[PDB]
Amino acid sequence: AVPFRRTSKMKKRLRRTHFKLNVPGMTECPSCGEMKLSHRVCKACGSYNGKDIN
Amino acid sequence: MIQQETRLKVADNSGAREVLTIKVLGGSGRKTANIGDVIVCTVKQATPGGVVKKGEVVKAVIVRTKSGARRSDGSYISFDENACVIIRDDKSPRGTRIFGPVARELRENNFMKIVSLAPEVI
Amino acid sequence: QKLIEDITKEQLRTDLPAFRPGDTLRVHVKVVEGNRERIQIFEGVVIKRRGGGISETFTVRKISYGVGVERTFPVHTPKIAKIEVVRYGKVRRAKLYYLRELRGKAARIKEIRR
Amino acid sequence: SYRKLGRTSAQRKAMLRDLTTDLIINERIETTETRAKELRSVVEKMITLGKRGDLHARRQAAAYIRNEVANEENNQDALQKLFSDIATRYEERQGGYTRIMKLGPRRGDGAPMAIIELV
Amino acid sequence: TKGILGRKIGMTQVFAENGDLIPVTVIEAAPNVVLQKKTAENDGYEAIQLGFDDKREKLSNKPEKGHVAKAETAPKRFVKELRGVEMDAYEVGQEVKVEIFSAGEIVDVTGVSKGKGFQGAIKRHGQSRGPMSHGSRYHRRPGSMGPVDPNRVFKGKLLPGRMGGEQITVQNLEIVKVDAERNLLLIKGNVPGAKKSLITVKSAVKS
RNA sequence: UUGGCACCUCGAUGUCGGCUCAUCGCAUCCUGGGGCUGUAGUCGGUCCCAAGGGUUGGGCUGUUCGCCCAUUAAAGCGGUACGCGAGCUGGGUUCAGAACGUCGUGAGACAGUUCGGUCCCUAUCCGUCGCGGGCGCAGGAAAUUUGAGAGGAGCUGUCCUUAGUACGAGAGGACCGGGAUGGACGCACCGCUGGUGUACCAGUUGUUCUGCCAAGGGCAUCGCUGGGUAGCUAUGUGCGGACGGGAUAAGUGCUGAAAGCAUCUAAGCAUGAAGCCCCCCUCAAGAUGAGAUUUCCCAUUCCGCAAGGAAGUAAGAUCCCUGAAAGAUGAUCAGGUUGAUAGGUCUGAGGUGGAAGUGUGGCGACACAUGGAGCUGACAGAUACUAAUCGAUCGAGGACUUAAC
């Protein structure tokens, strides 16, 4: 199977639609911020409700 | 569970030793025949003095399988050796005795002579 | 499986003694020919005990006329009338499916009456 | 269900027998995420044998704990550390011995690291 | 035609009256509450919504909290119609339960089948494997699409897909017993749908 | 089909036959229904309608075909690039090797035969089969739907009665109609029968290791067996093609004319098929003709005098997390501390089947007791003990002409 005819410059961009990556769910640490991501321990201070676990 | 080409040892004094299936009789059709199911067969090996000889095409009837007989009451009958009893055009058998134990489901078929000729109908 | 169970707490048959796999018990089987009820004896070696409450099973196996008869049965079914335990047995294992081969002395030698 | 972890059924046993030992020495490990969530199901069985302390109970636990000296200068094996230290601490607790805290992903492969601590 | 709906639990063996052995399901379907009477004077057709297996208030919404106000009971998860009962003998708020059925009522039963996941051409359609030896590389696969001249695949040529997840009626069952003490049905045979799924136990179309 | 012609293709259109997967045409093999019979019943010949469904397991040969074995309601033809090689097999023809007969003086030749002889491709597009993300459906939302339309199913054999009845010299043997039971095919599921089950349990060989014994670990396909729960399942079990309704084909007609009688037809009314349309089951309002009913949240704050535009927000949802009956990922579904969603811990169920250790019998290998003991993967029911914290993002203000209010 060999591609019978080249993809034009429209169809090439129309598969880039869902190809976009997305935001991370991000909030701030109530210790420091800014910012954390959701439910996982920050690199900022390393507190997580709220023990200072480095 | 006795389909085409299944060598069934015989269980009577009719002369035969090993019976080869050809075609289970029911329908278009089927490929299995558990217990009490009439088969068209030949005889591959025989005790040497016998009216049914080697290479003769005479029908037969299963009695036992290593496959189960499933009674409708939970209990299951399953033997350790396959079987045949050989029939001559009506359900009176050509054989004289019928060796070994016998699945009792034959009596619920039309084989009431075959049950009477056989020692442990269980 | 509690509410599975407590339905069938009623018909849990409670007129038989317990038994291990490797032993011999007699079964009293109610058997219909038309129209009466022979209570035919049944005899031989127990093997299987595939469990499950009402769904339990057991297999008495009987050599007869040189031929083995593998026969299962219900653990609480009403057709089994009475159970008479003849032998017990020191048996190493709990599923004796090897003796659907072994005839006949070494089957008997593994029937050590404990 | 259980987790295949991309390892053969013997490779997983050598996988899990190492990590359960390393919680005994370290008190905390930074594995990957499904190396964390799948480790808590074993250690909370393994600490459960610690509370017994039978001569039979220790000989079950030696098949998931290796032979590694845990504390220097006392020469304690990780087998000894369960029945001496850990079981003397968890006679209050009934389950949930190791809480798992997720950390961010790792650089070189994007793998979600995760922190296990006993508690 | 009467019909109630509910969860199932599993399979059992219940012997009865003979030496028999019956393959029996266990159904949780009591009790249903009439939430809304679909009427042909407004909607054209005749039906009754029934709700089942009430849930706690965190799981229920204000559009649906007010929907149970005509029956005046707790919010309730599983809602379906039933076209169409003998009209009516029902009032919105009457707790329909097991008491209708008996040992002898022939019953059709519908439910959403056990989804097995993305399965190939043999398992999804009963298609047959090719030769596993003799140098043949074609096995496990659906094979020839169609002819050459129409230059396309005819719609309906079976292919791999996601097997399961439909709703399946299975007909002509026999309800064994009635347990209004424990809210339990008992139906001969196999009933579609996985463990703890929802199952509508109708009355059949006979005879 | 063998052909004629050479008009697509010799900068390549893979040729025979099998395996899969089919559809379609009926000029019909059955099954449904009828005329005639050189049809007494039974079984036929033959001509009609009828494609809905079924249309087998071999032996032989590369074979299609063909014959034969035995069944069967029957074992239909035929097209679709003599269907189907970017789906497979090369057994033959027609690569080189190699022989045999024949022919030629010889190289070699032969639709004359025979043994051996690299069958390549990551799927671009349209198709097909499943899954999603937008948007629309004159405000946003949550449930349940209706059905225009789309599919699936559509096969039948026995047996017993009716009835040894009609029929028949007799032999032989019913029509119609009921009732039980199969075959094949299909749709489900695991309670039994089983299979499997690589973190379940027991035994065991070699070596290696925890100082040694005892006890265990490693590796040998999981070292090897013998068992096995949950799940996936078939050969296992349950169900299916039912009863119907409505118009029709070929028939069969009742009336009646033209053509005083006659005449199924021209006006008029019927009956009649496994055919058609529904009933049975599945999808389904993207059905832009965007349907329906129930219950919700409301009708903000600012700019633009205005048309309009933003920002904050309710009903609800989404990100994020624990997962599973779901599952490729998305999705669905159970759930997020007025919590059982998952793991653990208990109490169990099933599985394995008598733990270590101790004492005793035995010189010993081993047995016996403590003791259905010990060990347990997803299987059940409790328990906040652990992880589902924090929080964020999205989402309305309902155009206007007319009719009735």
PDB file of N, CA, C and O (backbone and C1' of nucleotides) in Angstrom, chain E residues 13 45 56 61-63 77 81 114-115 117 128 136-138 144 148 153 156 162 172 188 190, chain F residues 20-21 81 84 88 120 129 145 189-191 232 237-238 240 316-317 326-328 335-336 339:
ATOM      1  N   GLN E  13     -29.127 -23.234  41.367  1.00  0.00           N
ATOM      2  CA  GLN E  13     -29.788 -24.490  41.044  1.00  0.00           C
ATOM      3  C   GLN E  13     -30.888 -24.677  42.067  1.00  0.00           C
ATOM      4  O   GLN E  13     -30.609 -24.714  43.266  1.00  0.00           O
ATOM      5  N   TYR E  45     -49.474   7.968  22.793  1.00  0.00           N
ATOM      6  CA  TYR E  45     -49.291   6.563  23.124  1.00  0.00           C
ATOM      7  C   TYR E  45     -49.517   6.358  24.612  1.00  0.00           C
ATOM      8  O   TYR E  45     -49.653   7.305  25.384  1.00  0.00           O
ATOM      9  N   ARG E  56     -29.023   8.019  47.027  1.00  0.00           N
ATOM     10  CA  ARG E  56     -28.944   9.106  47.987  1.00  0.00           C
ATOM     11  C   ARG E  56     -28.855  10.452  47.269  1.00  0.00           C
ATOM     12  O   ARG E  56     -28.522  10.533  46.084  1.00  0.00           O
ATOM     13  N   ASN E  61     -30.342  15.207  40.807  1.00  0.00           N
ATOM     14  CA  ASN E  61     -30.351  16.602  40.421  1.00  0.00           C
ATOM     15  C   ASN E  61     -31.734  17.216  40.595  1.00  0.00           C
ATOM     16  O   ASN E  61     -32.758  16.534  40.563  1.00  0.00           O
ATOM     17  N   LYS E  62     -31.751  18.529  40.767  1.00  0.00           N
ATOM     18  CA  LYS E  62     -32.980  19.317  40.826  1.00  0.00           C
ATOM     19  C   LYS E  62     -33.931  19.233  39.629  1.00  0.00           C
ATOM     20  O   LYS E  62     -35.126  19.474  39.825  1.00  0.00           O
ATOM     21  N   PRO E  63     -33.501  18.946  38.391  1.00  0.00           N
ATOM     22  CA  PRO E  63     -34.504  18.559  37.393  1.00  0.00           C
ATOM     23  C   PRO E  63     -35.165  17.249  37.698  1.00  0.00           C
ATOM     24  O   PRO E  63     -36.302  17.013  37.278  1.00  0.00           O
ATOM     25  N   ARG E  77     -32.873   5.887  40.643  1.00  0.00           N
ATOM     26  CA  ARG E  77     -31.961   5.795  39.506  1.00  0.00           C
ATOM     27  C   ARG E  77     -32.609   5.413  38.192  1.00  0.00           C
ATOM     28  O   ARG E  77     -32.681   6.222  37.264  1.00  0.00           O
ATOM     29  N   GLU E  81     -39.787   3.032  30.386  1.00  0.00           N
ATOM     30  CA  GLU E  81     -41.208   2.908  30.085  1.00  0.00           C
ATOM     31  C   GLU E  81     -41.670   1.460  30.151  1.00  0.00           C
ATOM     32  O   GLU E  81     -40.901   0.538  30.424  1.00  0.00           O
ATOM     33  N   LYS E 114     -23.699  -8.275  28.513  1.00  0.00           N
ATOM     34  CA  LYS E 114     -22.353  -8.142  29.050  1.00  0.00           C
ATOM     35  C   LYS E 114     -21.403  -7.741  27.934  1.00  0.00           C
ATOM     36  O   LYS E 114     -21.198  -8.499  26.985  1.00  0.00           O
ATOM     37  N   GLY E 115     -20.833  -6.547  28.035  1.00  0.00           N
ATOM     38  CA  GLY E 115     -19.939  -6.068  27.002  1.00  0.00           C
ATOM     39  C   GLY E 115     -18.587  -6.731  27.099  1.00  0.00           C
ATOM     40  O   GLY E 115     -17.951  -6.689  28.151  1.00  0.00           O
ATOM     41  N   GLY E 117     -15.920  -6.137  24.907  1.00  0.00           N
ATOM     42  CA  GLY E 117     -14.836  -5.354  24.363  1.00  0.00           C
ATOM     43  C   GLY E 117     -14.631  -5.618  22.888  1.00  0.00           C
ATOM     44  O   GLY E 117     -15.373  -6.358  22.239  1.00  0.00           O
ATOM     45  N   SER E 128     -15.539 -18.232  10.648  1.00  0.00           N
ATOM     46  CA  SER E 128     -14.727 -19.419  10.808  1.00  0.00           C
ATOM     47  C   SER E 128     -13.285 -19.159  10.410  1.00  0.00           C
ATOM     48  O   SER E 128     -13.005 -18.581   9.356  1.00  0.00           O
ATOM     49  N   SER E 136      -0.168 -21.914   5.392  1.00  0.00           N
ATOM     50  CA  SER E 136      -1.120 -20.837   5.229  1.00  0.00           C
ATOM     51  C   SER E 136      -0.902 -19.780   6.290  1.00  0.00           C
ATOM     52  O   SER E 136      -0.768 -20.092   7.474  1.00  0.00           O
ATOM     53  N   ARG E 137      -0.859 -18.529   5.853  1.00  0.00           N
ATOM     54  CA  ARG E 137      -0.724 -17.395   6.746  1.00  0.00           C
ATOM     55  C   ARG E 137      -2.072 -16.825   7.126  1.00  0.00           C
ATOM     56  O   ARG E 137      -2.212 -16.242   8.205  1.00  0.00           O
ATOM     57  N   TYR E 138      -3.069 -17.004   6.272  1.00  0.00           N
ATOM     58  CA  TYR E 138      -4.424 -16.565   6.567  1.00  0.00           C
ATOM     59  C   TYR E 138      -5.012 -17.465   7.640  1.00  0.00           C
ATOM     60  O   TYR E 138      -5.460 -18.575   7.365  1.00  0.00           O
ATOM     61  N   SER E 144     -12.347 -12.300   2.301  1.00  0.00           N
ATOM     62  CA  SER E 144     -12.681 -11.597   1.070  1.00  0.00           C
ATOM     63  C   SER E 144     -13.851 -10.659   1.248  1.00  0.00           C
ATOM     64  O   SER E 144     -14.873 -11.026   1.821  1.00  0.00           O
ATOM     65  N   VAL E 148     -15.193  -7.581  -7.767  1.00  0.00           N
ATOM     66  CA  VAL E 148     -14.345  -6.532  -8.304  1.00  0.00           C
ATOM     67  C   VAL E 148     -15.154  -5.435  -8.985  1.00  0.00           C
ATOM     68  O   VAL E 148     -14.943  -4.253  -8.703  1.00  0.00           O
ATOM     69  N   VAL E 153     -17.149  -2.090  -0.988  1.00  0.00           N
ATOM     70  CA  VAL E 153     -17.618  -3.038   0.007  1.00  0.00           C
ATOM     71  C   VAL E 153     -19.110  -2.835   0.192  1.00  0.00           C
ATOM     72  O   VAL E 153     -19.558  -1.712   0.440  1.00  0.00           O
ATOM     73  N   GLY E 156     -22.768  -4.128   5.250  1.00  0.00           N
ATOM     74  CA  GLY E 156     -23.207  -5.329   5.928  1.00  0.00           C
ATOM     75  C   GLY E 156     -22.184  -6.439   5.964  1.00  0.00           C
ATOM     76  O   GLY E 156     -22.384  -7.411   6.700  1.00  0.00           O
ATOM     77  N   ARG E 162     -16.744  -3.544  18.312  1.00  0.00           N
ATOM     78  CA  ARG E 162     -16.975  -3.655  19.742  1.00  0.00           C
ATOM     79  C   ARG E 162     -18.177  -4.549  19.984  1.00  0.00           C
ATOM     80  O   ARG E 162     -19.312  -4.168  19.689  1.00  0.00           O
ATOM     81  N   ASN E 172     -39.770 -16.221  26.516  1.00  0.00           N
ATOM     82  CA  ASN E 172     -40.475 -17.449  26.900  1.00  0.00           C
ATOM     83  C   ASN E 172     -39.935 -18.104  28.158  1.00  0.00           C
ATOM     84  O   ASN E 172     -40.005 -19.321  28.304  1.00  0.00           O
ATOM     85  N   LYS E 188     -36.171 -19.423  35.389  1.00  0.00           N
ATOM     86  CA  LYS E 188     -35.496 -20.522  34.705  1.00  0.00           C
ATOM     87  C   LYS E 188     -34.563 -20.020  33.616  1.00  0.00           C
ATOM     88  O   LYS E 188     -34.961 -19.225  32.764  1.00  0.00           O
ATOM     89  N   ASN E 190     -30.888 -18.764  31.572  1.00  0.00           N
ATOM     90  CA  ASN E 190     -29.927 -17.679  31.563  1.00  0.00           C
ATOM     91  C   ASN E 190     -30.588 -16.390  31.112  1.00  0.00           C
ATOM     92  O   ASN E 190     -31.332 -16.352  30.129  1.00  0.00           O
TER      93      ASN E 190
ATOM     94  P     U F  20     -13.990 -23.070   4.434  1.00  0.00           P
ATOM     95  O5'   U F  20     -13.524 -21.815   5.272  1.00  0.00           O
ATOM     96  C5'   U F  20     -14.338 -20.671   5.339  1.00  0.00           C
ATOM     97  C4'   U F  20     -13.518 -19.421   5.262  1.00  0.00           C
ATOM     98  C3'   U F  20     -14.327 -18.153   5.280  1.00  0.00           C
ATOM     99  O3'   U F  20     -14.608 -17.784   6.601  1.00  0.00           O
ATOM    100  C1'   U F  20     -12.621 -18.038   3.637  1.00  0.00           C
ATOM    101  P     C F  21     -16.116 -17.524   7.013  1.00  0.00           P
ATOM    102  O5'   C F  21     -16.310 -15.994   6.654  1.00  0.00           O
ATOM    103  C5'   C F  21     -17.581 -15.529   6.277  1.00  0.00           C
ATOM    104  C4'   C F  21     -17.503 -14.498   5.194  1.00  0.00           C
ATOM    105  C3'   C F  21     -18.685 -14.470   4.260  1.00  0.00           C
ATOM    106  O3'   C F  21     -19.825 -13.879   4.846  1.00  0.00           O
ATOM    107  C1'   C F  21     -16.696 -14.260   3.021  1.00  0.00           C
ATOM    108  P     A F  81     -16.143  -9.173 -11.267  1.00  0.00           P
ATOM    109  O5'   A F  81     -15.605 -10.433 -12.070  1.00  0.00           O
ATOM    110  C5'   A F  81     -15.627 -10.429 -13.490  1.00  0.00           C
ATOM    111  C4'   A F  81     -14.348 -10.931 -14.120  1.00  0.00           C
ATOM    112  C3'   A F  81     -13.487 -11.902 -13.318  1.00  0.00           C
ATOM    113  O3'   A F  81     -12.884 -12.782 -14.275  1.00  0.00           O
ATOM    114  C1'   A F  81     -12.200 -10.053 -13.921  1.00  0.00           C
ATOM    115  P     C F  84     -11.676 -13.178  -9.307  1.00  0.00           P
ATOM    116  O5'   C F  84     -11.417 -12.986  -7.749  1.00  0.00           O
ATOM    117  C5'   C F  84     -11.365 -11.702  -7.153  1.00  0.00           C
ATOM    118  C4'   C F  84     -11.372 -11.811  -5.653  1.00  0.00           C
ATOM    119  C3'   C F  84     -10.234 -12.614  -5.061  1.00  0.00           C
ATOM    120  O3'   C F  84      -9.093 -11.822  -4.857  1.00  0.00           O
ATOM    121  C1'   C F  84     -12.300 -13.287  -4.102  1.00  0.00           C
ATOM    122  P     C F  88      -2.590 -12.477   0.752  1.00  0.00           P
ATOM    123  O5'   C F  88      -2.651 -14.012   1.131  1.00  0.00           O
ATOM    124  C5'   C F  88      -2.086 -14.470   2.344  1.00  0.00           C
ATOM    125  C4'   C F  88      -2.470 -15.898   2.614  1.00  0.00           C
ATOM    126  C3'   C F  88      -1.855 -16.936   1.700  1.00  0.00           C
ATOM    127  O3'   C F  88      -0.531 -17.279   2.048  1.00  0.00           O
ATOM    128  C1'   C F  88      -4.158 -17.359   1.932  1.00  0.00           C
ATOM    129  P     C F 120       4.374 -13.268  -0.510  1.00  0.00           P
ATOM    130  O5'   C F 120       5.123 -11.874  -0.554  1.00  0.00           O
ATOM    131  C5'   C F 120       6.531 -11.817  -0.444  1.00  0.00           C
ATOM    132  C4'   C F 120       7.009 -10.395  -0.462  1.00  0.00           C
ATOM    133  C3'   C F 120       6.032  -9.375   0.083  1.00  0.00           C
ATOM    134  O3'   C F 120       6.086  -9.294   1.491  1.00  0.00           O
ATOM    135  C1'   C F 120       6.976  -8.599  -1.945  1.00  0.00           C
ATOM    136  P     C F 129     -20.923  -1.581   7.340  1.00  0.00           P
ATOM    137  O5'   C F 129     -20.527  -1.909   8.833  1.00  0.00           O
ATOM    138  C5'   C F 129     -19.954  -3.153   9.159  1.00  0.00           C
ATOM    139  C4'   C F 129     -19.008  -3.020  10.316  1.00  0.00           C
ATOM    140  C3'   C F 129     -19.434  -2.071  11.410  1.00  0.00           C
ATOM    141  O3'   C F 129     -20.317  -2.718  12.298  1.00  0.00           O
ATOM    142  C1'   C F 129     -17.101  -1.878  10.936  1.00  0.00           C
ATOM    143  P     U F 145     -37.706   4.427  28.096  1.00  0.00           P
ATOM    144  O5'   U F 145     -38.739   4.831  26.962  1.00  0.00           O
ATOM    145  C5'   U F 145     -38.319   5.529  25.806  1.00  0.00           C
ATOM    146  C4'   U F 145     -39.395   6.481  25.376  1.00  0.00           C
ATOM    147  C3'   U F 145     -39.857   6.365  23.944  1.00  0.00           C
ATOM    148  O3'   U F 145     -40.796   5.320  23.793  1.00  0.00           O
ATOM    149  C1'   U F 145     -39.588   8.652  24.548  1.00  0.00           C
ATOM    150  P     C F 189     -24.041 -12.381  27.462  1.00  0.00           P
ATOM    151  O5'   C F 189     -23.647 -13.238  28.739  1.00  0.00           O
ATOM    152  C5'   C F 189     -24.408 -13.126  29.925  1.00  0.00           C
ATOM    153  C4'   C F 189     -24.822 -14.471  30.453  1.00  0.00           C
ATOM    154  C3'   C F 189     -23.755 -15.260  31.176  1.00  0.00           C
ATOM    155  O3'   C F 189     -23.646 -14.844  32.522  1.00  0.00           O
ATOM    156  C1'   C F 189     -25.037 -16.676  29.750  1.00  0.00           C
ATOM    157  P     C F 190     -22.306 -15.106  33.359  1.00  0.00           P
ATOM    158  O5'   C F 190     -22.319 -16.668  33.673  1.00  0.00           O
ATOM    159  C5'   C F 190     -23.046 -17.181  34.782  1.00  0.00           C
ATOM    160  C4'   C F 190     -22.595 -18.567  35.176  1.00  0.00           C
ATOM    161  C3'   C F 190     -21.156 -18.681  35.670  1.00  0.00           C
ATOM    162  O3'   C F 190     -21.073 -19.663  36.693  1.00  0.00           O
ATOM    163  C1'   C F 190     -21.480 -20.088  33.813  1.00  0.00           C
ATOM    164  P     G F 191     -21.494 -19.318  38.197  1.00  0.00           P
ATOM    165  O5'   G F 191     -22.851 -20.124  38.367  1.00  0.00           O
ATOM    166  C5'   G F 191     -23.324 -20.519  39.640  1.00  0.00           C
ATOM    167  C4'   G F 191     -23.964 -21.877  39.569  1.00  0.00           C
ATOM    168  C3'   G F 191     -23.132 -22.949  38.897  1.00  0.00           C
ATOM    169  O3'   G F 191     -22.192 -23.513  39.792  1.00  0.00           O
ATOM    170  C1'   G F 191     -25.357 -23.029  38.091  1.00  0.00           C
ATOM    171  P     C F 232     -16.816 -12.723  31.397  1.00  0.00           P
ATOM    172  O5'   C F 232     -15.806 -13.466  30.422  1.00  0.00           O
ATOM    173  C5'   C F 232     -15.071 -12.734  29.456  1.00  0.00           C
ATOM    174  C4'   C F 232     -14.350 -13.659  28.522  1.00  0.00           C
ATOM    175  C3'   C F 232     -15.236 -14.622  27.758  1.00  0.00           C
ATOM    176  O3'   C F 232     -15.721 -14.064  26.555  1.00  0.00           O
ATOM    177  C1'   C F 232     -13.438 -15.798  28.760  1.00  0.00           C
ATOM    178  P     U F 237     -26.548 -29.654  27.764  1.00  0.00           P
ATOM    179  O5'   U F 237     -27.351 -28.461  28.437  1.00  0.00           O
ATOM    180  C5'   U F 237     -27.745 -28.538  29.796  1.00  0.00           C
ATOM    181  C4'   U F 237     -28.078 -27.180  30.346  1.00  0.00           C
ATOM    182  C3'   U F 237     -29.222 -26.454  29.668  1.00  0.00           C
ATOM    183  O3'   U F 237     -30.488 -26.867  30.134  1.00  0.00           O
ATOM    184  C1'   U F 237     -27.400 -24.983  29.918  1.00  0.00           C
ATOM    185  P     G F 238     -31.772 -26.764  29.176  1.00  0.00           P
ATOM    186  O5'   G F 238     -32.055 -25.200  29.061  1.00  0.00           O
ATOM    187  C5'   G F 238     -32.630 -24.477  30.137  1.00  0.00           C
ATOM    188  C4'   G F 238     -32.931 -23.061  29.735  1.00  0.00           C
ATOM    189  C3'   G F 238     -33.629 -22.884  28.399  1.00  0.00           C
ATOM    190  O3'   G F 238     -35.029 -23.076  28.479  1.00  0.00           O
ATOM    191  C1'   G F 238     -31.817 -21.394  28.537  1.00  0.00           C
ATOM    192  P     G F 240     -38.947 -20.847  22.921  1.00  0.00           P
ATOM    193  O5'   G F 240     -38.465 -20.213  21.547  1.00  0.00           O
ATOM    194  C5'   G F 240     -38.834 -18.895  21.201  1.00  0.00           C
ATOM    195  C4'   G F 240     -37.988 -18.367  20.080  1.00  0.00           C
ATOM    196  C3'   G F 240     -38.155 -19.057  18.745  1.00  0.00           C
ATOM    197  O3'   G F 240     -39.239 -18.536  18.015  1.00  0.00           O
ATOM    198  C1'   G F 240     -35.857 -18.754  19.225  1.00  0.00           C
ATOM    199  P     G F 316     -29.071  21.211  40.117  1.00  0.00           P
ATOM    200  O5'   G F 316     -27.737  21.048  39.281  1.00  0.00           O
ATOM    201  C5'   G F 316     -27.471  19.827  38.626  1.00  0.00           C
ATOM    202  C4'   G F 316     -27.370  20.024  37.146  1.00  0.00           C
ATOM    203  C3'   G F 316     -26.129  19.436  36.518  1.00  0.00           C
ATOM    204  O3'   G F 316     -26.239  18.051  36.274  1.00  0.00           O
ATOM    205  C1'   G F 316     -26.358  21.645  35.805  1.00  0.00           C
ATOM    206  P     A F 317     -25.203  17.057  36.982  1.00  0.00           P
ATOM    207  O5'   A F 317     -23.818  17.421  36.298  1.00  0.00           O
ATOM    208  C5'   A F 317     -23.414  16.734  35.131  1.00  0.00           C
ATOM    209  C4'   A F 317     -22.733  17.631  34.129  1.00  0.00           C
ATOM    210  C3'   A F 317     -21.227  17.540  34.069  1.00  0.00           C
ATOM    211  O3'   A F 317     -20.769  16.360  33.434  1.00  0.00           O
ATOM    212  C1'   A F 317     -21.871  19.794  33.945  1.00  0.00           C
ATOM    213  P     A F 326     -18.708  -5.986  31.178  1.00  0.00           P
ATOM    214  O5'   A F 326     -18.538  -4.415  31.001  1.00  0.00           O
ATOM    215  C5'   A F 326     -19.342  -3.708  30.067  1.00  0.00           C
ATOM    216  C4'   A F 326     -18.808  -2.323  29.794  1.00  0.00           C
ATOM    217  C3'   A F 326     -17.576  -2.240  28.915  1.00  0.00           C
ATOM    218  O3'   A F 326     -17.911  -2.292  27.544  1.00  0.00           O
ATOM    219  C1'   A F 326     -17.327  -0.825  30.791  1.00  0.00           C
ATOM    220  P     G F 327     -16.977  -3.065  26.500  1.00  0.00           P
ATOM    221  O5'   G F 327     -15.638  -2.232  26.511  1.00  0.00           O
ATOM    222  C5'   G F 327     -15.599  -0.928  25.976  1.00  0.00           C
ATOM    223  C4'   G F 327     -14.268  -0.321  26.259  1.00  0.00           C
ATOM    224  C3'   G F 327     -13.104  -1.102  25.712  1.00  0.00           C
ATOM    225  O3'   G F 327     -12.897  -0.774  24.359  1.00  0.00           O
ATOM    226  C1'   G F 327     -12.655  -0.350  27.921  1.00  0.00           C
ATOM    227  P     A F 328     -11.868  -1.580  23.443  1.00  0.00           P
ATOM    228  O5'   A F 328     -10.456  -0.947  23.781  1.00  0.00           O
ATOM    229  C5'   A F 328      -9.384  -1.730  24.268  1.00  0.00           C
ATOM    230  C4'   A F 328      -8.113  -0.963  24.103  1.00  0.00           C
ATOM    231  C3'   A F 328      -8.173   0.458  24.645  1.00  0.00           C
ATOM    232  O3'   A F 328      -7.705   0.514  25.984  1.00  0.00           O
ATOM    233  C1'   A F 328      -7.486   0.481  22.377  1.00  0.00           C
ATOM    234  P     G F 335     -23.328   5.051  42.735  1.00  0.00           P
ATOM    235  O5'   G F 335     -22.218   5.763  43.617  1.00  0.00           O
ATOM    236  C5'   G F 335     -21.426   6.806  43.080  1.00  0.00           C
ATOM    237  C4'   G F 335     -20.088   6.858  43.757  1.00  0.00           C
ATOM    238  C3'   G F 335     -19.608   8.233  44.157  1.00  0.00           C
ATOM    239  O3'   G F 335     -20.193   8.664  45.360  1.00  0.00           O
ATOM    240  C1'   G F 335     -17.863   7.081  43.095  1.00  0.00           C
ATOM    241  P     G F 336     -20.231  10.220  45.707  1.00  0.00           P
ATOM    242  O5'   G F 336     -19.289  10.331  46.969  1.00  0.00           O
ATOM    243  C5'   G F 336     -18.599  11.535  47.213  1.00  0.00           C
ATOM    244  C4'   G F 336     -17.125  11.353  47.031  1.00  0.00           C
ATOM    245  C3'   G F 336     -16.300  12.611  47.143  1.00  0.00           C
ATOM    246  O3'   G F 336     -16.032  12.917  48.492  1.00  0.00           O
ATOM    247  C1'   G F 336     -15.590  11.327  45.283  1.00  0.00           C
ATOM    248  P     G F 339     -21.936  10.073  53.074  1.00  0.00           P
ATOM    249  O5'   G F 339     -20.531  10.579  52.534  1.00  0.00           O
ATOM    250  C5'   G F 339     -20.312  10.775  51.144  1.00  0.00           C
ATOM    251  C4'   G F 339     -19.263   9.842  50.596  1.00  0.00           C
ATOM    252  C3'   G F 339     -19.688   8.392  50.439  1.00  0.00           C
ATOM    253  O3'   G F 339     -19.056   7.878  49.280  1.00  0.00           O
ATOM    254  C1'   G F 339     -17.797   8.496  51.813  1.00  0.00           C
TER     255        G F 339
END
